[PDB]
């Protein structure tokens, strides 16, 4: 339920299809 702002730096969000989606490290 609660959204905890976890300290991350390996995930990046782009706004795709009008929605927020995060990139990826390995394919």
Give the Cα-Cα-Cα angle 27, 13, 23 (nearest 5 degrees).
5
- C-alpha distances in Å from residue 3, one per residue of 17, 23, 26: 23, 20, 26
How far is C-alpha 27 from the geometric centre of its chain's CA atoms?
A: 16
Q: How was this structure determined?
A: NMR
Three-state SS at 14: strand
Tokens found for residue 20: 């927020």
């Amino acid at each position: 339920g609660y959204i905890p702002e976890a300290p991350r730096d390996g995930q990046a969000y782009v706004r795709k299809d009008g929605e927020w989606v995060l990139l990826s490290t390995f394919l």
